[PDB]
Amino acid sequence: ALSLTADQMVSALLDAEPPILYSEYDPTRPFSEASMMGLLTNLADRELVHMINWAKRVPGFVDLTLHDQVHLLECAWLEILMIGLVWRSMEHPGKLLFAPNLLLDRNQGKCVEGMVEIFDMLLATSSRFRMMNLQGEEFVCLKSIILLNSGVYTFLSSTLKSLEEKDHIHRVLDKITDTLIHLMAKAGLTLQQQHQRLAQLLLILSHIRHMSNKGMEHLYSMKCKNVVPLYDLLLEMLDAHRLHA
Amino acid sequence: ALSLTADQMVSALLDAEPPILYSEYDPTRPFSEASMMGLLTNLADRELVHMINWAKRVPGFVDLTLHDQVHLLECAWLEILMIGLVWRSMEHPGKLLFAPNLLLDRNQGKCVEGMVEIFDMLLATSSRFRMMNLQGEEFVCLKSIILLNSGVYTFLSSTLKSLEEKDHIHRVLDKITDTLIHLMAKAGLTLQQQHQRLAQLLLILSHIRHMSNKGMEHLYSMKCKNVVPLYDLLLEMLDAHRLHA
Numbered sequence: 001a002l003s004l005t006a007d008q009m010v011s012a013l014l015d016a017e018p019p020i021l022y023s024e025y026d027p028t029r030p031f032s033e034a035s036m037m038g039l040l041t042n043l044a045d046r047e048l049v050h051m052i053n054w055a056k057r058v059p060g061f062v063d064l065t066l067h068d069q070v071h072l073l074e075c076a077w078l079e080i081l082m083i084g085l086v087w088r089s090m091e092h093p094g095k096l097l098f099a100p101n102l103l104l105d106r107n108q109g110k111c112v113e114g115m116v117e118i119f120d121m122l123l124a125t126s127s128r129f130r131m132m133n134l135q136g137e138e139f140v141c142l143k144s145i146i147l148l149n150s151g152v153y154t155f156l157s158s159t160l161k162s163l164e165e166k167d168h169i170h171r172v173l174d175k176i177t178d179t180l181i182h183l184m185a186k187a188g189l190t191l192q193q194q195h196q197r198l199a200q201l202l203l204i205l206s207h208i209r210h211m212s213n214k215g216m217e218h219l220y221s222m223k224c225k226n227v228v229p230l231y232d233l234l235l236e237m238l239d240a241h242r243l244h245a
Numbered sequence: 246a247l248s249l250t251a252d253q254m255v256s257a258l259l260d261a262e263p264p265i266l267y268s269e270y271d272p273t274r275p276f277s278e279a280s281m282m283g284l285l286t287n288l289a290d291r292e293l294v295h296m297i298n299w300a301k302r303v304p305g306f307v308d309l310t311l312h313d314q315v316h317l318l319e320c321a322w323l324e325i326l327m328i329g330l331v332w333r334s335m336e337h338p339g340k341l342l343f344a345p346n347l348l349l350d351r352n353q354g355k356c357v358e359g360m361v362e363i364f365d366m367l368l369a370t371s372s373r374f375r376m377m378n379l380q381g382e383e384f385v386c387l388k389s390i391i392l393l394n395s396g397v398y399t400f401l402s403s404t405l406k407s408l409e410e411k412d413h414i415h416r417v418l419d420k421i422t423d424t425l426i427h428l429m430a431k432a433g434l435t436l437q438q439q440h441q442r443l444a445q446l447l448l449i450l451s452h453i454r455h456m457s458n459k460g461m462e463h464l465y466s467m468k469c470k471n472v473v474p475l476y477d478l479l480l481e482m483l484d485a486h487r488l489h490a
């Protein structure tokens with residue numbers, strides 16, 4: 001990640017992309033009888049296992065301690081799901097493609113109290129991506145930045161080890177910045193367009209943080225799931241043996 | 246703002262800086278008897294009038310409709326107060342300089358339920374600014390970006406006028422990006438350091454959004470003040486006559 005080229009980061013990031021999952025409900029049955037939140041929650045929980053997989057393939061992530069890996073994912077998981085959703089919704093104006101067999105419009109979000117507000121924010125982000133003509137190569141860089149950036153300011157303590165971890169993370173972030181600029185230059189943007197586009201992309205990440213924060217507030221008031229704290233469940237998942245090697 | 250130079254934006258932004266206010270409490274009296282939240286709330290309300298003043302001097306802001314000006318400030322006001330606080334706290338490791346006569350450490354935040362968590366996040370941002378050696382010229386650009394960026398994705402409708410406003414805002418944001426790159430080049434950074442530093446700065450804005458969101462959640466559960474909705478109070482303030490010209 002720190003000696004990988006900009007072309008190697010791009011291909012590592014493309015190679016690491018997770019699969020597109022489907023909603024799990026019987027399509028031979030009516031819809032009024034489905035719990036929309038139940039459908040969405042079940043989807044999101046299944047994505048989380050693939051997210052851990054993906055994160056381990058982001059250059060530099062697994063060189064972190066297990067504790068720091070847990071922290072970053074605990075901080076970024078909803079942001080990561082949401083940029084993923086906005087990305088596959090890009091080509092579907094006015095709709096969110098939760099899954100290939102679960103495409104919802106804003107009125108379908110009114111079904112859940114306080115959810116249309118979140119839908120509207122996601123929908124607006126999807127339209128901005130569309131207006132910017134965001135590219136697959138740029139999107140994977142952005143998702144990796146979310147993973148590494150979102151919880152890097154909240155590491156508690158400040159041990160020697162902790163200091164080293166922070167330095168490495170900021171080093172990897174620098175390399176993804178170099179990769180985004182490289183992508184843009186390749187595409188034929190001027191120096192000036194490059195830095196402007198870089199800023200445009202990075203400023204969207206402030207909106208994705210906003211959506212995550214608002215979505216956590218909204219989720220935190222519902223059946224959803226809050227069994228076994230998230231840290232411990234992430235740890236479990238990340239603290240793998242290497243027996244099935 | 247769209248024909249202003251990078252040097253003209255910088256000087257307009259420096260010229261527009263608001264004053265540093267003091268806490269209003271009798272310094273000849275003990276401290277256990279003060280409401281810390283009362284002190285902080287009174288400080289923050291006094292800053293808001295100066296914030297409106299400042300925003301009107303940001304290049305491009307007053308060319309927006311009154312409604313859009315209200316929206317952006319309603320979305321960004323806590324982010325703007327917080328970056329301001331982290332900026333004047335930079336030279337005071339382990340402390341937050343709320344005002345020149347009100348410098349608090351984390352233990353002083355434990356006095357309020359759930360406030361130490363916010364203090365710790367602000368303190369960590371202040372240390373990052375310090376570690377990056379953030380410059381006065383960079384800070385004013387960043388505060389202006391917060392003003393223009395934070396609520397630009399949440400404008401409801403999408404009228405012709407609305408579309409025009411968005412275009413102008415993104416145009417002004419582009420010019421502040423050009424200004425930040427200009428500042429960095431002047432300072433002698435390489436091309437590579439410039440784009441890396443730009444990204445480092447912009448990624449901090451995602452943490453400031455985080456702090457604002459968490460602070461609104463925390464404020465929203467206390468005496469504070471929620472009399473007359475914020476929109477109407479902002480409108481009042483922004484919808485000035487020009488009689489005292």
Ligand SMILES: C[C@H]1CN(CCOc2ccc([C@@H]3Oc4ccc(O)cc4S[C@@H]3c3ccc(O)cc3)cc2)C[C@@H]1C
Binds near residue numbers: 044047084225
């Ligand atoms: C991975 C964690 C998620 N599990 C709890 C439920 O989480 C979610 C439930 C539903 C969704 C909602 O559905 C999805 C589904 C997939 C996806 O990639 C994105 C979203 S976003 C949306 C959402 C988010 C926040 C809201 O306030 C409203 C709608 C997203 C997450 C707990 C588990 C540890």
Ligand SMILES: C[C@H]1CN(CCOc2ccc([C@@H]3Oc4ccc(O)cc4S[C@@H]3c3ccc(O)cc3)cc2)C[C@@H]1C
Binds near residue numbers: 286288363478
């Ligand atoms: C401008 C709006 C603010 N008024 C309500 C009270 O708002 C505030 C009250 C206290 C502060 C707290 O004190 C200050 C004071 C000045 C400053 O520049 C920053 C801060 S930050 C801090 C804070 C913020 C959020 C928390 O959860 C905990 C501490 C910041 C804002 C309502 C008014 C319309």
